[PDB]
Amino acid sequence: TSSALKGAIQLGITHSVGSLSQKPERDVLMQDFEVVESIFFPSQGSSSTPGHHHGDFKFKTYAPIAFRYFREMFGIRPDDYLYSLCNEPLIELSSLFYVSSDDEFIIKTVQHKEAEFLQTLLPGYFMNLNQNMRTLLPKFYGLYCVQADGKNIRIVVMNNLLPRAVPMHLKFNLKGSTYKRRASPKERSKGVPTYKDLDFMQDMPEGILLENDHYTALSRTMQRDCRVLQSFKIMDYSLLVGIHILHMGGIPAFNSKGERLLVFIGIIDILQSYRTVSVHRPSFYADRFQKFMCSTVFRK
């Protein structure tokens, strides 16, 4: 019964943000990042909580005020968040993901270790957001946890980098590494294949050309996201990249042949940190990661 999770997500977020938009607004304080609040949904029902078809669950909203601030800094009006996520069926896919009917939000699960680490990331995330306004890291809208009979599933709601609205003719999941970085042929048979690194280097060996103008932003704001990531001892993150070819949100690019492109990029899987690996190893992953994307994958 996946349906028992979709509903518990949808029920609880409504109750969480619903009750918040009545409380009046205030600034975020360091105190707000470690708050975790819990509301209880009996199948019978309660004075606070409506009854439902699914079984009894507690719904846990992590760091609620801080994600209110993050959502607003991101443009996510509360009424839209709630409608998109809690008032329309959720599609699965095949860590475990979902999407909104809208295709604007992605949900993902996260190991207890990864959610706990997100909580510690918040202040540095706040700092990066408020310094590097064109950063590529995940746009985190909320951290939640549904408590089943004796298990916890932990969800982080975040932004969809590749929306149905723009048609993606190429997909890539890149890391700057080579080992097994080649699309499992099971995946290679989708019409929407998310090719990996070796796949890239042969299919697109003259690269993705960028103007002297826009290539500089990338090189600059990636050096920034990599300095942020290695600071926090993070690894195994990919630069996900969808390409679209022509005959408004993304980057404009020129093809090896010369067709005009619009490239859509973002850094994903940033919650595995190492705070046995070496002292200087996450720095190695960053320097590689960046010297790759900003030489092999995008050039001037």
Q: Which residues bind a second copy (CB under 8 A)?
A: 26-31, 69, 123-124, 126-128, 130-132, 224, 227-228, 231
Among 66, 90, 106, 253, binds ligand ATP (CB under 6 A): 106
The residue count for the chain = 300
Residue 231: DSSP 8-state: H
Residue 269 interacts with ligand ATP (CB under 6 A): yes or no: yes
- Least Cβ distance, residue 115 to ligand ATP (angstroms): 13
Q: Give the residue at shortest CB distance from ligand ATP.
A: 95
Among residues 231 and 295, whose Cβ is nearest to a second copy?
231
Which one of the spans 5-13, 157-165, 204-212, 276-284 is the region binding ligand ATP (CB under 6 A)?
157-165
- Least Cβ distance, residue 131 to a second copy (angstroms): 5
The answer to whether 267 touches 225, Cβ cutoff 8 Å, is yes
Q: Which does 20 bind (CB under 5 to 8 A by kind): a second copy, ligand ATP, Ca ion, none?
A: none
Residue 110 interacts with ligand ATP (CB under 6 A): yes or no: no
What mask, x for binding ligand ATP by CB under 6 A, covers residues 42 to 81? ----------------------------------------
Residue 173 interacts with ligand ATP (CB under 6 A): yes or no: yes
Q: If we measure between CA atoms, which residue out of 163, 104, 125 comes closest to residue 32?
A: 125
Full strand arrangement of the beta sheet holding 251-255: 194-195, 170-174, 238-243, 260-268, 251-255, 208-209
Q: Which of residues 185-204 bind ligand ATP (CB under 6 A)?
A: 194
In what helix (H) or strand (E) does residue 39 lie, and over which residues does it extend? strand 36-41
Beta bridge partners, 57, equal: 41
β-strands 194-195, 170-174: how paired? Answer: parallel
Full strand arrangement of the beta sheet holding 105-109: 36-41, 57-62, 140-147, 152-159, 105-109, 97-99, 91-92
Largest CA distance in the chain: 65
Chain residues in the site for ligand ATP (CB under 6 A): 95, 106, 158-162, 173, 194, 236, 238, 240, 268-269
